[PDB]
């Protein structure tokens, strides 16, 4: 009967059992070990011979316990490991780990043999991700870092396109694997710059889905100080090009995060960026400061970043004075554009009001700092720009006054 029970496992089992926490775990586990131990699956062929065996998943779903998995973790994991598409085994192993997060178990130091079942690259990264997710029981004591250390990832983030066409069967798996690899190395420059940009330019081309998890992982890894302040500086900001998230309005949804993340980068690489890099950065932020794609949050962040950017540029420009004046004219042209945006904020008079007040505060500080920089046909154009500024600033202060210390 056992073979056909799989389709009707909901009946006659929940009625005839109750202590199944500690009385039918020892029934499911031997059942699993007797059912899954053959594993005649295939990965580089048509539908495998074991295709009829998928029904055991419901029995796996019905695993009873959330505790004391010590006698039933390693054996069930290893018999799966014997399998060496590969999702046929990942489907079972993922459930094994999902039910394995809660319970206490040990001998997890078998990671050194487990890695042999993990990426070699001469979807697998999902297992180490759940491992590092429930790692709270042991933390880095199990493996230190070796499972994902520099030498593994320095080989072009350990992953690269091998065939230009085969396309979801390969590229989707690569998409998932890169994201999981980034998410695991999060914990701890060639890889995370060159491979980063290379994969950005090629992998998300299908419909740009990859950018979601990839960008979230990028944010998380860039939270880690030196991996943000020093390591990525080799790029020279040349990755600010279209390659970051080109596509449909998935671009619209994710670009705010990309701009905020590169703003976090800038907040620190302001320490040492050259004048030309600063110039192109302020050029990009000139487009950002008035983008309609997002509410004033992005505009506020861009001008706030511009504040310290122009602090650094003011410090730098006084040297040699010529490139200094050259950049000074364009940086004040940026706030010329800002006053031009105020010329439309005038019509915008028809909560967000507080955000507008914060924006006004930020840009007022910005113009103050800009003028401080300038003073530390020039004058006629100064006067023209200031006339425009004065005429337009009242139109913003009027909204500021809508409905104080």
């Amino acid at each position: 009967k056992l073979k056909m029970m799989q389709e009707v496992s909901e009946n006659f089992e929940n009625v005839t059992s109750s202590p199944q926490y500690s009385t039918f775990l020892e029934h499911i586990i031997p059942r699993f070990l007797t059912f899954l131990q053959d594993g005649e699956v295939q990965f580089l062929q048509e539908k495998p011979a074991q295709q009829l065996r998928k029904l055991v998943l419901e029995i796996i779903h019905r695993i009873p316990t959330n505790e004391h998995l010590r006698p039933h973790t390693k054996n069930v994991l290893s018999v799966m490991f014997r399998f060496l598409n590969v999702l046929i085994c990942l489907r079972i192993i993922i459930e094994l780990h999902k039910q394995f997060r809660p319970p206490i178990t040990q001998e997890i130091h078998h990671f050194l043999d487990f890695v042999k079942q993990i990426y070699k690259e001469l979807v697998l990264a999902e297992l180490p991700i759940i491992v590092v997710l429930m790692y709270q029981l042991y933390k880095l004591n199990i493996h230190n870092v070796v499972a994902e250390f520099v030498p593994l990832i320095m080989n072009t983030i350990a992953i690269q396109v091998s065939a230009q066409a085969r396309y979801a069967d390969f590229i989707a798996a690569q998409i998932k694997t890169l994201s999981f690899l980034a998410y695991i190395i999060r914990i701890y420059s060639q890889q995370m710059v060159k491979g980063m940009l290379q994969l950005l330019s090629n992998c998300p081309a299908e419909t740009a889905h990859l950018r979601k998890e990839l960008l979230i992982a990028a944010k998380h890894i860039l939270t880690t100080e030196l991996r943000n302040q020093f390591i990525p500086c080799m790029d020279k900001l040349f990755d600010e090009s279209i390659l970051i998230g080109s596509g449909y309005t998935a671009r619209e949804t994710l670009r705010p995060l990309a701009y905020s993340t590169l703003a976090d980068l800038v907040h620190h690489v302001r320490q040492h960026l050259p004048l030309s890099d600063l110039s192109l950065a302020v050029q990009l932020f000139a487009k950002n400061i008035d983008d309609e794609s997002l509410p004033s949050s992005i505009q506020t962040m861009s001008c706030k970043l511009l504040l310290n950017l122009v602090d650094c540029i003011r410090s730098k420009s006084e040297q040699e004075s010529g490139n200094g004046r050259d950049v000074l004219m364009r940086m004040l042209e940026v706030f010329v554009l800002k006053f031009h945006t105020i010329a439309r904020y005038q019509l915008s008079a028809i909560f967000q009001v507080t955000d507008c007040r914060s924006l006004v505060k930020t840009l007022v500080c910005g113009v103050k700092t800009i003028t401080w920089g300038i003073t530390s046909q020039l004058q006629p154009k100064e006067t023209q720009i200031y006339i425009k500024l004065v005429k337009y600033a009242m139109q913003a202060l009027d909204i500021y006054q809508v409905q104080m210390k």
């Binding site: 779903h61 396309y167 979801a168 069967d169 989707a172 299908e206 419909t207 740009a208 889905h209 979601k212 596509g247 449909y248 309005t249 998935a250 949804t253 994710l254 487009k287 008035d290 983008d291 309609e292 042209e333 554009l337 031009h340 945006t341 439309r344 046909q377």
Partner: protein, 532 residues
């Protein structure tokens, strides 16, 4: 004036920027109208000029100034546009300028305002991306308030199409953007019949932004002068490796649901689209899937028993897979879903407790319309909301319940274990269950657990815990009109009274107030000592 513009102000002097700025300042003066006229009557020197870059920008500046002074100066449009379009298209590869493109686009739009949609209205969208192009984009978007006030008959093929063969699909995107309001604001002529099938151009992929907007527009276009034809539009990306962004999937599925809502409630697609719509979305496509589901929301109950509302079978898988916060909304808009209402409480815990509040109204709706499944779920919801310490929604739960235990026995210890956050929350901690006892025999049935708990709580009176004492004495004053807990609390109050031997005074007198009132039956023994 006529001598000036050619005496010391010709092309050779435009190289000097200050000289040109001084000239443009003169031209800007309002009263200098003849000085602008001498040029306005002679566009030939602009025509000879605009076909170098510096003088091109200067010509754009001066001509824009002229047009601003005289917007009616469209007479030379038929000759000027010939090269204005040339330079407008060319500058993209020249740069992609400080203000030049915006001025040129303004001139082009102003000349376009003298006509409805045409080729130039398409072409003026070409550059974009420059200065964020908000100036020109707003100019044209506001220009539809004039354009919309008869050009729709073949707009689709004399403003769209036109094969600019230099610009990309953004030409179609923005044109569709501005097309939509015209049709929303305003005959089902035969031209639309042919256009609806000319749309795809018999292409085989059409998996792009253009399809998304076009189908979003056509969703309301099928009123009256079939299934297979609409199938071509709705189905295409069901191909495996494609449609990776659920935006295009959900646009087509929403259009199909609109077809389903119209006449096509058929067992071929009705049950197929539903269970497939709520999949594959994690963070951002959730904002797209909800509106598509809204169209099936009225259609599915039109069958209900004919389909047995079998989607419980789908839920049996989905709940394990992942969200399900769409199933019960049919009742909220208003039947037998109480048999699986337990899933709401079953799925919580490591968390999104919000569903409990949402389902409380549905549960009371079920009770009014048609339970033991409610009396335990409500207590579980109450304890789980109390775990936050929140919100008046917790009170709303009981308020709705009483129109037609566990937390009590937990919270005595939940206060005994006391911690700054706990001290702050203590008032809400007590109030959460002390609000029920004012309207139920919950305490009168058995106050011993409370006596065990509260007896060691008022001693911690401070900041918010004092407010907890204020809340609980109010419940005492309602219960009393239990003697053992009163005696214990009176002893506590007496020892605190003796403790003085002003915050201490405040706590002491507040406990004395708690002991007092209750009718003077119990206060005499207390009053005997209050003199000291």
């Amino acid at each position: 004036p006529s001598q000036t513009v050619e005496l010391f102000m010709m092309e050779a002097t435009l190289n000097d920027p200050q000289w040109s700025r001084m000239f443009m300042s003169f031209l800007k003066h309002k009263d200098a109208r003849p000085l602008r006229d001498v040029l306005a009557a002679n566009p030939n020197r602009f025509i000879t000029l605009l076909l170098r870059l510096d003088l091109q920008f200067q010509a754009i500046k001066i001509i824009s100034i002229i047009v601003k002074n005289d917007d009616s100066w469209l007479a030379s449009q038929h000759s000027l546009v010939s090269q204005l379009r040339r330079v407008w298209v060319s500058e993209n590869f020249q740069e992609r300028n400080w203000k030049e493109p915006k001025l040129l686009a303004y001139c082009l739009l102003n000349y376009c305002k003298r006509n409805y949609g045409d080729i130039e209205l398409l072409f003026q969208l070409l550059r974009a991306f420059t200065g964020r192009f908000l100036c020109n984009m707003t100019f044209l978007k506001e220009y539809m308030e004039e354009e919309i006030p008869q050009k729709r008959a073949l707009f689709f093929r004399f403003v769209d199409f036109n094969d600019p063969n230099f610009g990309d699909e953004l030409k179609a995107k923005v044109l569709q953007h501005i097309l939509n309001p015209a049709f929303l604001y305003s005959e089902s002529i035969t031209s639309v019949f042919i256009t609806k099938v000319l749309d795809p151009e018999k292409q085989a992929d059409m998996l792009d932004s253009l399809r998304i907007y076009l189908l979003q527009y056509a969703t309301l276009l099928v009123e009256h002068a079939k299934l297979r034809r609409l199938m071509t539009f709705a189905w295409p990306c069901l191909l495996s490796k494609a449609c990776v962004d659920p935006a295009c999937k959900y646009s087509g599925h929403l259009l199909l649901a609109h077809i389903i809502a119209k006449f096509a409630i058929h067992k071929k697609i009705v049950l197929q689209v539903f269970h497939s719509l709520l999949k594959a979305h994690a963070m951002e496509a959730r904002a797209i899937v909800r509106q598509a589901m809204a169209i099936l929301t009225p259609a599915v109950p039109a069958r209900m028993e004919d389909g047995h509302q079998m989607l419980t079978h789908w839920t049996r898988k989905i709940i394990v897979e992942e969200l399900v916060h769409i199933l019960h909304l049919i009742v909220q808009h208003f039947h037998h879903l109480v048999q699986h209402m337990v899933s709401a409480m079953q799925r919580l815990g490591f968390e999104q407790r919000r569903l409990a509040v949402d389902l409380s109204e549905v549960v009371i709706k079920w009770e009014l319309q048609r339970d033991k499944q409610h009396t335990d779920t409500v207590v579980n919801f109450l304890i789980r909301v109390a775990c936050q310490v929140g919100e008046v929604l917790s009170r709303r739960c009981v308020n709705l319940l009483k129109t037609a235990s566990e937390l009590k026995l937990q919270w005595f210890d939940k206060l005994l274990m006391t911690v700054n956050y706990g001290n702050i929350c203590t008032g809400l901690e007590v109030l959460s269950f002390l609000l029920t006892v004012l309207q139920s025999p919950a305490i009168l049935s058995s106050f011993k657990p409370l006596q065990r708990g509260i007896a060691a709580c008022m001693t911690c009176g401070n900041t918010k815990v004092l407010r907890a004492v204020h809340s609980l004495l109010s419940r005492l004053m309602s219960i009393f009109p239990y003697e053992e807990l009163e005696c214990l609390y009176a002893a506590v109050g007496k020892v605190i009274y003796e403790g003085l031997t002003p915050s201490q005074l405040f706590g002491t007198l507040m406990i004395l107030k708690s002991a007092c009132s209750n009718n003077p039956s119990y206060i005499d023994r207390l009053i005997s000592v209050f003199m000291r």
